[PDB]
Design an enzyme around this catalytic site. Structure first.
Site, short mmCIF file in Angstrom:
data_model
loop_
_atom_site.label_atom_id
_atom_site.label_comp_id
_atom_site.label_asym_id
_atom_site.label_seq_id
_atom_site.Cartn_x
_atom_site.Cartn_y
_atom_site.Cartn_z
N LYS A 80 1.26 4.60 -9.69
CA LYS A 80 2.68 4.78 -9.21
C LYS A 80 3.21 4.44 -10.40
CE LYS A 80 2.23 3.97 -4.16
NZ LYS A 80 2.52 5.41 -4.04
N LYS B 266 8.83 2.60 -4.04
CA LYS B 266 7.64 2.65 -3.15
C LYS B 266 7.08 1.38 -3.77
CE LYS B 266 7.88 6.09 -6.27
NZ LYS B 266 6.26 6.95 -5.20
N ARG B 267 5.56 1.51 -2.38
CA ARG B 267 4.70 0.33 -3.26
C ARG B 267 4.23 -0.25 -4.95
NH1 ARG B 267 2.06 -2.56 0.64
NH2 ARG B 267 1.40 -3.23 -0.50
N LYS C 13 11.08 12.14 1.21
CA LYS C 13 11.97 12.11 2.24
C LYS C 13 13.75 11.97 1.19
CE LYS C 13 9.91 8.18 4.00
NZ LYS C 13 9.59 7.11 3.54
N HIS D 14 -7.46 10.32 2.57
CA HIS D 14 -6.10 9.91 1.85
C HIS D 14 -5.25 9.18 0.86
CE1 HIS D 14 -3.75 10.13 6.11
NE2 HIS D 14 -4.26 9.26 6.33
N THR E 195 5.79 10.40 -0.25
CA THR E 195 6.37 11.59 1.07
C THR E 195 7.52 11.64 0.72
OG1 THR E 195 5.56 8.80 2.66
CG2 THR E 195 4.29 11.19 3.45
C1 LIG Z 1 8.02 6.43 2.66
C2 LIG Z 1 7.78 5.30 2.14
C3 LIG Z 1 6.89 4.81 1.33
C4 LIG Z 1 6.29 6.08 0.73
O1 LIG Z 1 6.52 6.12 -0.65
P1 LIG Z 1 5.50 7.27 -1.61
O2 LIG Z 1 6.77 7.10 -2.76
O3 LIG Z 1 5.12 8.15 -1.00
O4 LIG Z 1 4.48 6.11 -1.83
C5 LIG Z 1 6.63 3.49 1.16
N1 LIG Z 1 7.41 2.28 2.02
C6 LIG Z 1 8.14 2.77 2.87
C7 LIG Z 1 9.32 1.92 3.40
C8 LIG Z 1 8.46 3.97 3.08
O5 LIG Z 1 9.37 4.49 4.02
C1 LIG Z 2 -5.00 5.18 1.47
C2 LIG Z 2 -3.24 5.47 1.05
O1 LIG Z 2 -2.71 5.09 1.62
N1 LIG Z 2 -3.06 7.20 0.55
C3 LIG Z 2 -1.82 6.70 0.44
O2 LIG Z 2 -1.53 8.24 2.02
C4 LIG Z 2 -0.42 8.84 2.21
C5 LIG Z 2 -0.03 9.44 3.25
O3 LIG Z 2 -1.54 10.40 3.13
C6 LIG Z 2 0.41 9.88 0.25
O4 LIG Z 2 1.21 10.39 1.15
C7 LIG Z 2 -0.25 8.61 -0.59
O5 LIG Z 2 0.08 9.62 -1.43
C8 LIG Z 2 -0.97 8.34 -0.58
O6 LIG Z 2 -1.25 6.80 -1.64
#
Ligand SMILES: *Cc1c(COP(=O)(O)O)cnc(C)c1O
Ligand SMILES: CC(=O)N[C@@H]1O[C@H](CO)[C@@H](O)[C@H](O)[C@H]1O
Ligand SMILES: O=C(N[C@@H](Cc1ccccc1)C(=O)N1CC(C(=O)O)C1)c1cc2cc(Cl)ccc2[nH]1
Ligand SMILES: O=C(N[C@@H](Cc1ccccc1)C(=O)N1CC(C(=O)O)C1)c1cc2cc(Cl)ccc2[nH]1
Ligand SMILES: *Cc1c(COP(=O)(O)O)cnc(C)c1O
Ligand SMILES: CC(=O)N[C@@H]1O[C@H](CO)[C@@H](O)[C@H](O)[C@H]1O
Ligand SMILES: O=c1[nH]c(=O)c2[nH]c(=O)[nH]c2[nH]1
Ligand SMILES: O=c1[nH]c(=O)c2[nH]c(=O)[nH]c2[nH]1
Lengths: 793, 791
Positions: free
Chosen positions: B535, B529-530, B641, B338, B637
């Site tokens: 990012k 996102k985090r 969404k 990942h 992901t």
């Molecule tokens: C989907 C989701 C994420 C993943 O977001 P990315 O933009 O793909 O890092 C992170 N936190 C929550 C609560 C999510 O629902």
């Molecule tokens: C180690 C880790 O948390 N990796 C995370 O995994 C998700 C699920 O595959 C990816 O969408 C994302 O790009 C990535 O930063």
């Protein structure tokens, strides 16, 4: 609540609540399905009962205790709700054994012994008497440790009683409350403030207390500690520190351990309880002038003593009442029960500890004491030593607070738990206070509930009695005196003896499957179960056992009434003498049980993990109840009462309630022996020299020499050195001093036992006179002379 | 019908909650409804597990340290076909269905995308009728609740179990012992691990209902308990063993080598394999058929210990010969990679493993010896190849390369999006893929259309269903049918209306929480996102300031107004991430209170972003910020969404963004900045942030403002650490994409001025997002890795 419907509810819970079918369900699953099936029957009346208290606002009673030794709940609930026979049928039709399901339930062992069991019996009696009463305690994650015996020694295992869930408890989120610790005090122009404190949340869990056949279901509210929500990992882990407050019950019976964590538990239960009580009062459809007419709080010993200065804190600092008024309402609210007079059991908290943890409470305590001594200095200007004696503070070096003194001045009534005990409390220990206030000191002899300790544990007996005199005795135990009419009824005596026999067979099966030993079902079941204490003297008993073994070794063919001697009980973890005595007994039992010459003549068992559910098994199977504390040491006792009610004869000293048992049944109907209170005093003055008896009594010497020379511990000949040393030079319970009279008494017991008709006649006289000892009578006296509350029959 | 649901509700309120209507709390009502719904799961749950026992299909075990489940009530009502009926019952009972639903705590046992992917996967596997199980840890505390104090992030314990979790079911009869520490004894009877400390593992099963199919699967989570063999201290010390499942490590894409974390990893792994083996032995199935009945997916390297644990079981306990055992092990395990971020790589120091898990270290060495022996045979001279392929890193501090362990111990290794899988295969693990080409694969991530469409956006779901039917829920590719409406202006206004309703509904949210007054007319620009340097919410922040400095100069220019939302949690020990948040709250304070800007622009740092919040802000979004440096976001992901919910994407050619563009047409997304190659070339040439700073006047001001205290007058050099990183240590090249990003942003505003063209592009995005359903992802995993079939 009919058989067909109970099976359906059981199946419904197994399905939806336990997510199982008959193929994959475990025994635990079945227990839980039945528990929920029974539990649903409480709901309607629990809601109605608590709703009725709010509408009619009867004066409420709050029983505040750090202990509630409840035992198991399933059976008790079925019985008080009149559901047992139907449930028994339902389970049987489902192809299960209700008694096997019952054994899955963990005891709610949230107590050490009598003090905690008294609270439990009280809740049952109060719900049965229809009083608006509440029990307030701590929801310990771990109760009294589970006791294991390894290589003859007691080993402690954590009692993780909540591991699989407690269907009998209900979380009450909406009533959570914050409790404060540490911090500092500020005396501002808007009142004094207790600030910069550490906060721990108290989440209350309610357990229903069903009365016996009356639609009443009261509440037992137990508080659980939780960390508040405003290195990250460590910070989250440290939430454990606050939660440790309700983690485990302190395992000491009659002994004061001044640990800071214990002090934290004490304020925790007191702060949460009183704030919850005041909250309810303020929401009642009732100014605070009527508080004492709406609230009574009983202090179970001095453990919740802080409740007095906490109530004052609330009234003064929070409710803004003037000291004088706060003080008045406080005394009228509290009543205190003193449960002991052993020096080492006295609660005396060091002032420095209280100052650091509860600064505002220390201040208030000093004030209380000041107004306390100023009044004495007035009435007795010269007597300077009187002020020293009545002070809430002991300044002799390490300054500490005398919690009993604080309970006495903050309460309107103080009571002992047995006549002889209450007398000593009033005229000796607290003379300065009773002379100053005569009417404050009372007696309230202990009692036991005849539901749990008769109906539940000995149905055969409860049924036999009911056939002779009806069921009214359940709710009015003094009705057992009618049994006197059958003293010459031969067939009834045979029926009585059959019930004891069946109880004995049933328990003999428990023993054989739990221990190696082969039990002589016809031998006399000589029993001593209670916490291990030097003052309770299972050591004296052990001397008698060794004595009987030697008699057998000498005269193998002498006519001997066979006995199965059972001794059980837990020793506090750090109580060395207690642990040594247990090891002594197990060592003795190993020799006796394996000596070819004695065989089925004498068997000895150290009953492991003695607790409420095990007391319910062994008590009904008992012939001889050992209640042999040194005169003046057992405030009352209640195990003594359980055996009396269940058909055992008592061999004991004139101590605690043993004295009133003798008064009720006739002294000739109990095997009383040894020194009485005056004899102990006299022997004290003269000076007790253990050696005399040892030299003076040949059978005792052989016993002593054997223990001392390794006879009972070949591989470690000096193993029992400490026991021997304590016995000759530091025994304050005069074991050797009662040895002679004790053994002579034991022989008379065996004599009577050979006469089945004479024996059972005396048993009947005991059962027929046991009525006074119902906790329903004890509670009536508390309601009438202290709480000023009335039932609802 | 409705009458029975109301009857069960009253029955639960009474018997289960012990309340009546005049005394019940809102929480009692929520619990009562939860129990009413939960009862509907029982029959199918018992039947589903019974069926797997009866027909014994191969079982898939998704082993993960995280499952970001969110709330369960609504999701369960929807998948069971019960929502309308329950909505009716609660309405008739005079209660507010929405109010009760908001009572539920999120089960936040995950950090971000990694844990959420596992949750989406559970939902899809159950919906496809696969005999699947989720295995993880039941943390007492999930990811922390985030608060903002004086502009900074503050953390609070997520005590999600305080009031009880009706959705979990303790399974006491399956408690197992897990061993720690101790030593290895090499005997003639066979090497044994002795004198270990023991910790019990108590499993809790939570049901996972498939969408409208009678399948209810299980997610089994383990909780640590002390075994029962100074007394008081001995009892309190039970807290230590129980600390193993106390809290989820709050790190996303970062390796923290703490011992407690290693304990958690072995805990879930040891309990899980034992339980799986026990279930195999009890089945109607030697072990030869073990891999034909069992497939275990290693979610990242976190449960890597499962490889040597299975070997330990096979060899030390079951007494199978090493060869046989190793063969079975490889056929059982499959590894999902990942991340390629160096700081995220798990490399445990040998000393730590030896201390805690001595027998596993020996097993790892053995696997390594046998591994390198093969490489020596195929490449006798290539000395450095052995170094690069060893599971052990001997440089100074010896540590175990968990990724390598996973590769040699599995039969399949996959990445989570085309771009990433290719990197993993031909770059990061080139020496391995060259030896076994077929072993490496790709499985582009997906999101479940239930939670992320039907549940979070009922309005959009209803609109789509009215026009193309309901088949798309189970076959998302069916969304392409929305193309038939490419010309329809009636449909385009409908589409815009739904987005409007969500924006309005959410706006009501933002103001009861935040002081700011939202311009409903504004374009919702969202980056949730985090918080990470890679990012780049920092880059986004440079744009916000750039926009602010533009309004200040030409207050009268025609401007598309915007509500810029940035939200996310920062790992507690991540200093930069925390500085970035403080920067955003500061910038927002200056922007939000400037009279000259007013309703032209507003900035919001969305506190406590998490699954339940995401379900709210995503459907209300117009523009989705997906701007990681090319090559850093393995997949992402959240991008998916937003695409499903009607938002246009402004992002780099990174992770699955690339594939979103391939599906909808590169011109239907706002792609900008450097691509993997460009970043590669810049790295070769060397990156000098000062240059773009010198060359870009708008950038210079932005920076000088940050660096001189414009956004922190009280403490002028507050953002010094940020300036220092951007200039001399920014490995994510914020300045290098600043120009293309700002231009791209201007183009977004352009299109936004044209409603018909904007929504025409949304339609094209929604119509092309079919590929990103986790149902498609799972089928690929099922067919190409686990070798299993639906039902
Ligand atoms: C989907 C989701 C994420 C993943 O977001 P990315 O933009 O793909 O890092 C992170 N936190 C929550 C609560 C999510 O629902
Ligand atoms: C180690 C880790 O948390 N990796 C995370 O995994 C998700 C699920 O595959 C990816 O969408 C994302 O790009 C990535 O930063
Ligand atoms: O917890 C459930 N039932 C409860 C039933 C229960 C309640 C109180 C005491 C004993 C048993 C349960 O099994 N336990 C609570 C105990 C604990 O807190 O550890 C153990 C439950 C039923 C159910 C049914 C579905 Cl479909 C999903 C989740 C479920 N949980
Ligand atoms: O705990 C009961 N019901 C349960 C119902 C429940 C179960 C699971 C999640 C939420 C609610 C309860 O209230 N809680 C379990 C939670 C916890 O673990 O703290 C809170 C309960 C019902 C009941 C009925 C009687 Cl008569 C006596 C005791 C009772 N307890
Ligand atoms: C009743 C009881 C006691 C008190 O017994 P005494 O012999 O009065 O000390 C102690 N422990 C248990 C388990 C009991 O049921
Ligand atoms: C401090 C303490 O536990 N005291 C105990 O209290 C019970 C209940 O009153 C008495 O029966 C018993 O004799 C006494 O030892
Ligand atoms: O730790 C102890 N607990 C007791 O209950 C006790 N009793 C006693 O005499 N000593 C001790 N010590
Ligand atoms: O404690 C941290 N957590 C992270 O997620 C992280 N990321 C990073 O670069 N440093 C840190 N530190």
């Amino acid at each position: 609540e009919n058989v067909a419907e109970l099976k359906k509810s059981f199946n419904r819970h197994l399905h939806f609540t336990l997510v199982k079918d008959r193929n994959v369900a475990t025994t635990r699953d079945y227990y839980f399905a039945l528990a929920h099936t029974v539990r649903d029957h409480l709901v309607g009346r629990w809601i109605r009962t608590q709703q009725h208290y709010y509408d009619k606002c009867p004066k409420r009673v709050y029983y505040l205790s750090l202990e509630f030794y409840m035992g198991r709940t399933l059976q008790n609930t079925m019985i008080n709700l009149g559901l047992q026979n139907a449930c028994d049928e339902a389970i049987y039709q489902l192809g299960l054994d209700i008694e096997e399901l019952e054994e899955i339930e963990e005891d709610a062992g949230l107590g050490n012994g009598g003090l905690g069991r008294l609270a439990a019996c009280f809740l049952d009696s109060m719900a049965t008497l229809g009083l608006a009463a509440y029990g307030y305690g701590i929801r310990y994650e771990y109760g009294i440790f589970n006791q294991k015996i390894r290589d003859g020694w007691q080993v402690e295992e954590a009692d993780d009683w909540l591991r699989y869930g407690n269907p009998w408890e209900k979380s009450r989120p909406e009533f959570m409350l914050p409790v404060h610790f540490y911090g500092k005090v500020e005396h501002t122009n808007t009142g004094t403030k207790w600030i910069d404190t550490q906060v721990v949340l108290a989440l209350p869990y309610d357990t229903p207390v069903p009365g016996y056949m009356n639609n009443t279901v009261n509440t037992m509210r137990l508080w659980s500690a939780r960390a508040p929500n405003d290195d990250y990992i460590q910070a989250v882990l440290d939430r454990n520190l606050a939660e440790n407050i309700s983690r485990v019950l302190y395992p000491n019976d009659n002994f004061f351990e001044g640990k800071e964590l214990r002090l934290k538990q004490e304020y925790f239960v007191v702060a949460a309880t009183l704030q919850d009580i005041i909250r309810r009062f303020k929401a009642s459809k009732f100014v605070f002038d009527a508080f004492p007419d709406q609230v009574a709080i009983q202090l179970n010993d001095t453990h919740p003593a802080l409740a007095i200065p906490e109530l004052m804190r609330i009234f003064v600092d929070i409710e803004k009442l003037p000291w004088s008024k706060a003080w008045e309402l406080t005394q009228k609210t509290f009543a205190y029960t003193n449960h002991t007079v052993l020096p080492e059991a006295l609660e005396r908290w060091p002032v420095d500890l209280v100052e650091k943890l509860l600064p505002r409470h220390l201040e208030i305590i000093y004030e209380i004491n000041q107004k306390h001594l100023d009044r004495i200095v007035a009435l007795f200007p010269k007597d300077v030593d009187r002020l020293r004696r009545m002070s809430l503070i002991e300044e002799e070096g390490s300054k500490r607070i005398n919690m009993a003194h604080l309970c006495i001045v903050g309460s309107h009534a103080v009571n002992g738990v047995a006549k002889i005990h209450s007398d000593i409390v009033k005229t000796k220990v607290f003379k300065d206070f009773s002379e100053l206030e005569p009417d404050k000191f009372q007696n309230k002899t202990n009692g036991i509930t005849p539901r749990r300790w008769l109906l539940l544990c000995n149905p055969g007996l409860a049924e036999l009695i009911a056939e002779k005199i009806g069921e009214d005795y359940v709710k009015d135990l003094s009705q057992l005196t009618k049994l006197h009419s059958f003293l010459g009824d031969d067939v009834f005596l045979r029926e009585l003896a059959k019930v004891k026999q069946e109880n004995k067979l049933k328990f003999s099966q428990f023993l054989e499957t739990e221990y190696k030993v082969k039990i002589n079902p016809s031998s006399m079941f000589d029993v001593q179960v209670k916490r291990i204490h030097e003052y309770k003297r299972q050591l004296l008993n052990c001397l008698h056992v060794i004595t009987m073994y030697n008699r057998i070794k000498k005269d193998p063919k002498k006519l001997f009434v066979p006995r199965t001697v059972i001794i059980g009980g837990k020793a506090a973890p750090g109580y060395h003498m207690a642990k040594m005595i247990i090891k002594l007994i197990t060592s003795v039992a190993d020799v006796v049980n394996n000596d070819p010459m004695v065989g089925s003549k004498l068997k000895v068992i150290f009953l492991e993990n003695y607790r409420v559910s095990l007391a319910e098994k062994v008590i009904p199977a008992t012939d001889l109840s050992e209640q042999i504390s040194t005169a003046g040491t057992e405030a009352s006792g209640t195990g003594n009462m359980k055996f009396m009610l269940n058909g055992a004869l008592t061999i004991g000293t004139m101590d605690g309630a043993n004295v009133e048992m003798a008064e009720e049944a006739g002294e000739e109907n109990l095997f009383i022996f040894g020194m009485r209170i005056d004899d102990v005093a006299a022997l004290d003055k003269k000076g007790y020299e253990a050696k005399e008896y040892y030299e003076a009594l040949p059978e005792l010497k052989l016993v002593i020499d054997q223990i001392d020379n390794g006879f009972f511990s070949p591989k470690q000949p000096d193993l029992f050195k400490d026991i021997i040393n304590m016995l000759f030079y530091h025994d304050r319970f005069k074991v050797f001093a009662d040895y002679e009279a004790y053994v002579k008494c034991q022989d008379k017991v065996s004599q009577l036992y050979m006469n089945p008709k004479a024996w059972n006649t005396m048993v009947l006289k005991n059962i027929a006179a046991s009525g006074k000892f119902s906790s329903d009578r004890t509670i009536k006296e508390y309601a009438q002379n202290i709480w000023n509350v009335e039932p609802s029959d």
